[PDB]
Every structure is written in structure tokens, then in C-alpha cells.
């Protein structure tokens, strides 16, 4: 009985967030990649192997692949912002 | 053989990449034809004195080519680029 009341405020935060949802497409559509290693800035430089210093000493490398990956939450198409969007509307980890 | 610590190979010459270098990448491969043709004169200058050491190829790229051929010796941080010797014949004091 109350679902049903609730269900006009439901349509009009639903239908507001694809709207957030289509602008942060149209902002951030594929800009959220980055490489392992923080010296390389495209898919093309981001290959092979690189040296990894632990914990900032650069008396301890480690040997590590390179990997030109994306975000976890990204906003690549419409479906990707929507639930990132939720992400964020949740107050979860919004400030990463 | 003697008069060299390690397993050699006079058929060809080795190539060193650093780690942090990717090899088959567009600089390298280009790099890594025309330093091919060095192999013919590795061999014939061994011909001449073969009482011979290492004639190695410090290119600018980072790639290393030297001859004879022998297979490189932890984690590997050696770059041609900062050795003594080459640094010493890139400029001057
Ligand atoms: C960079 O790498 C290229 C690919 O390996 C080399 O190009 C090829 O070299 C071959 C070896 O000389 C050529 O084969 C013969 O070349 C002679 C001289 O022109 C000719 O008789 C024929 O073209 C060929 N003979 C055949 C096919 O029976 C290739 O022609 C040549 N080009 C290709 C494969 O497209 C480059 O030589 C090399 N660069 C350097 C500086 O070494």
C-alpha cells in the first residue's frame, strides 16, 4: 500500500538520475583509464614491464607488468554512469 | 671458451633491453635492423685480433648490442645509457 503511494517521487528520481547519468557520460566517456606505473599516459607506452619501488624506497624494486586498465566505476555508457551514479547517491566511496 | 668467464657464441651478437623498456616497440625495432647489419663487421674485426673482448653497441634508444654473444648474468637495473663509458664519450666534461 505504501510502495505504491511512494511510486511518484520513484519515477521522478529515476527519471532525474538518467539525466546525471547521460551529462557524465557526455563528460567522462572513456576518460577514467590509467596505467600501472604512473610515468606512462596511453595504451601505447603501457606495455611490457616496469620497476615497482615499495612503499617509495628506492632501495627495495620489484618487477611488475604494466596494465592499461580502466576504472572500476566508470562512465562508458549510459548503464556504467546509472550505477555509478547510485554509487555516489549512496555516499559510499564518492571521494575516489 | 677461455679467456672469457662465461659461455660464448661467435654466430651472432646478443641484445640487451632494459626491464623498463619494452621490446617491439616502434624505436626499438627500428633500432633493432640496421644494428643488425653490425654483426658482419663484429665478426670480421674478431678475424683480424682474435685476442678480442666484448665490442659492445650503446645505442640511444637504451637497447645494448654486443658481441660475441653470451647470455646476461635478483632483479636486472643495468641501462646502457649510465654506464662510465658511455657517458664519457656522449659529451664532453
Ligand atoms: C629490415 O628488415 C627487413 C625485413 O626483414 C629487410 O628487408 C628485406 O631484406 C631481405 C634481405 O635482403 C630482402 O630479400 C631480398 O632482397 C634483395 C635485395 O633487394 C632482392 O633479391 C629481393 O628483394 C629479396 N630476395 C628475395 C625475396 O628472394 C627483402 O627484399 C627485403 N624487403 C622486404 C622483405 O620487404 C631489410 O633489409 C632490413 N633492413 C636492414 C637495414 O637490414
Same mark, same amino acid.
Given at each position: 500500500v505504501a510502495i505504491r503511494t511512494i511510486g511518484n517521487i520513484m519515477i521522478v528520481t529515476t527519471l532525474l538520475q538518467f539525466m546525471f547519468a547521460c551529462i557524465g557520460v557526455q563528460l567522462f =566517456?572513456? =576518460?577514467f583509464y590509467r596505467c600501472? !606505473? *604512473?610515468? =606512462?599516459? &596511453?595504451? *601505447? *607506452?603501457?606495455?611490457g614491464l616496469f620497476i615497482l619501488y615499495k612503499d617509495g624506497d628506492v632501495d627495495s624494486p620489484v618487477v611488475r607488468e604494466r596494465i592499461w586498465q580502466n576504472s !572500476?566505476? &566508470?562512465? !562508458?555508457n549510459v548503464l556504467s554512469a546509472m550505477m555509478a551514479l547510485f554509487t555516489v547517491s549512496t555516499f559510499e566511496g564518492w571521494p575516489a | 671458451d677461455a679467456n672469457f668467464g662465461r659461455q660464448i657464441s661467435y654466430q651472432h651478437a646478443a641484445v640487451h633491453i632494459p626491464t623498463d623498456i619494452y621490446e617491439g616497440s616502434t624505436i626499438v625495432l627500428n633500432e633493432l635492423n640496421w644494428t643488425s647489419a653490425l654483426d658482419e663487421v663484429f665478426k670480421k674485426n674478431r678475424e683480424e685480433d682474435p685476442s678480442l673482448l666484448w665490442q659492445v653497441f650503446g645505442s640511444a634508444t637504451g637497447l645494448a648490442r654486443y658481441y660475441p654473444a653470451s647470455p646476461w648474468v635478483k632483479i636486472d637495473l643495468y641501462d646502457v645509457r649510465r654506464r662510465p663509458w658511455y657517458i664519457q664519450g656522449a659529451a664532453s666534461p
Open positions: =566517456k572513456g =576518460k600501472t !606505473d *604512473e610515468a =606512462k599516459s &596511453n595504451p *601505447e *607506452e603501457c606495455r !572500476d566505476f &566508470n562512465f !562508458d | -
